[PDB]
Design a protein around this ligand. Structure first.
Ligand SMILES: C=C[C@@H]1C[C@]1(NC(=O)[C@@H]1C[C@@H](Oc2ncc(OC)c3ccc(Cl)cc23)CN1C(=O)[C@@H](NC(=O)OC(C)(C)C)C(C)(C)C)C(=O)NS(=O)(=O)C1CC1
Ligand SMILES: [Cl-]
Ligand SMILES: [Zn+2]
Length: 192
């Protein structure tokens, strides 16, 4: 069992969101096994990988957060070797490590906005209407396949603050009409 490896990143700053791949699937074996990753981290959102699966991780308040169902209890690879998890909550599906040096963190939202935006692993930014503490509705339904690999990514408010971490798709016969997320307030409670 190896470390989670950063294989890309998503930029949310400036005027244009974009994805950049920094490491190929072939291969992350050495980095996985050793937990030593030479690459200097950038950006707010990391594209991360285990042996055969990819997902996202988001820096908020100096902690790099992701989903347990992706990371498990794994360390994350870094230039100084494997980094042990700071936070682990299986009930919430939540993992956090100390944010990598050179990372930019998002600020938790206190706007109270109903209009949210989900950032996918391809750096698509899709509108979500908030509908409860941990739920939002997609304005356009999407096959679940479209959202697979985007867990751990941010839901943002219009000003680009973090509102939550994408956890699960609300699936009706293989089609997502809504998304379930870990709200930033819940991240705060975990940090208590
Ligand atoms: C389609 C894209 C969705 C965003 C995505 N997440 C999913 O697949 C999640 C995983 C799983 O949920 C949970 N696991 C473990 C938990 O704890 C450890 C949970 C604790 C609390 C809650 Cl809430 C959920 C938990 C089931 N699930 C669904 O989304 C499921 N939906 C779901 O369960 O919906 C309800 C929550 C509303 C029931 C289903 C599979 C049916 C869509 C993804 O992309 N993953 S991934 O590919 O990146 C993978 C990391 C590599
Ligand atoms: Cl890397
Ligand atoms: Zn806000």
């Amino acid at each position: 069992k190896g470390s989670v490896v950063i294989v890309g990143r998503i930029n949310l700053s400036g005027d244009t969101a974009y994805a950049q791949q920094t490491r190929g699937a072939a291969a992350c074996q050495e980095t996985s096994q050793t937990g030593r990753d030479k690459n200097q981290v950038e950006g707010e959102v990391q594209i991360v990988s285990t042996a055969t699966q990819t997902f996202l991780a988001t820096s908020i308040n100096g902690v790099l957060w992701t989903v347990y169902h992706g990371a498990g209890t794994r360390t994350i690879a870094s230039p100084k070797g494997p980094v042990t998890q700071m936070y682990t909550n299986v009930d919430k599906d939540l993992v956090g490590w100390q944010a990598p040096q050179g990372s930019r963190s998002l600020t938790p939202c206190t706007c109270g906005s109903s209009d949210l935006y989900l950032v996918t692993r391809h750096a698509d930014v899709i509108p979500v209407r908030r509908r409860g503490d941990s739920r939002g509705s997609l304005l356009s339904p999407r096959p679940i396949s479209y959202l697979k690999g985007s867990s751990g990514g941010p839901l943002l408010c219009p000003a680009g603050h973090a509102v939550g971490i994408f956890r699960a798709a609300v699936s009706t016969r293989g089609v997502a009409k809504a998304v379930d997320f870990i709200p930033v307030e819940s991240l705060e409670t975990t940090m208590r």
